[PDB]
């Protein structure tokens, strides 16, 4: 989850999120440098009493200021598209889990073997247990095995929603009549939080996602206990 006064991304939970952090670092250096250079050049143009107000020839300089940006865009696009096609590559999941968005809660279906399904609602503020997080906790967490490739399938039974977990690099819209696929792999155990990410009405702010990542043997026993 996010922490107070946070400036950047949540720490990466998945290898793809790690990749996104290094790509963001590369891109932001470029944004910083260009922003700075424009501000600097503004200040340079504005700090002399020397003048030159006759017609100035443009063609030589326009070569520089098309070619250099084209090269910079290629240096962004190359690693950008490498990550795009890395996520898309065939991975062989161990487990498929469905999530269905509703106004205003998530349901989860684990139907590889048994018909396991349940609803996941925000814990009201007045019912939080000491130490628990306002607007983020749910009654029934999405328990998943750590260090395993999981296929998540996302849809809705009413309006649009969007299933997001920032620390895993995940955001997939939940569209009725459509079954959208994404892959989830956690490098670590723990609790990973997200929030509905398509405006779905009055309680859009209040239908969070909590993943609980545990060893396979714990997941298997939890699965059995939830039938």
């Amino acid at each position: 989850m996010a922490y107070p006064m946070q400036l950047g991304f949540q720490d990466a939970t998945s290898p793809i999120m790690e990749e996104l952090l290094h790509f963001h670092d590369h891109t932001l250096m470029i944004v910083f440098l260009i922003s700075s250079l424009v501000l600097y050049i503004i200040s340079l143009m504005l700090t002399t009493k020397l003048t030159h107000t006759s017609t100035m020839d443009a063609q030589e300089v326009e070569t520089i200021w098309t070619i250099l940006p084209a090269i910079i865009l290629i240096l962004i696009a190359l690693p950008s598209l490498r990550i795009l096609y890395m996520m898309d590559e065939i991975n062989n999941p161990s487990l498929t889990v469905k999530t269905m968005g509703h106004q205003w809660y998530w349901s989860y279906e684990y139907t590889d073997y048994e018909d396991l399904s349940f609803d996941s609602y925000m814990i009201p503020t007045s019912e939080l247990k000491p130490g628990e997080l306002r607007l983020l906790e749910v009654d029934n967490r999405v328990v998943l095995p750590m260090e395993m490739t999981i296929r998540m399938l996302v849809s809705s039974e009413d309006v649009l929603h969007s299933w997001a977990v920032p620390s895993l690099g995940l955001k997939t819209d939940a569209i009725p009549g459509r079954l959208n696929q994404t892959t989830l792999m956690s490098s670590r155990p723990g609790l990973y939080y997200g929030q509905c990410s398509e405006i779905c009405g009055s309680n859009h702010s209040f239908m969070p996602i909590v993943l609980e990542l545990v060893p396979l043997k714990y997941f298997e026993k939890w699965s059995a206990s939830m039938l």
């Binding site: 990466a12 790690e18 952090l21 029934n140 967490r141 328990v143 750590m146 260090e147 490098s187 670590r188 155990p189 723990g190 609790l191 609980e212 545990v214 060893p215 714990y218 997941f219 026993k221 939890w222």
Partner: peptide
């Protein structure tokens, strides 16, 4: 990231979280 993961023990991390009482499932 390299230093964090070099000797990272995911089971040891899980056991610490379990003993702290964080999980619904463990």
């Amino acid at each position: 990231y390299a230093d964090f993961y070099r000797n990272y023990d995911s089971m040891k991390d899980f056991e610490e979280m379990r003993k702290a009482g964080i999980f619904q499932s463990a």
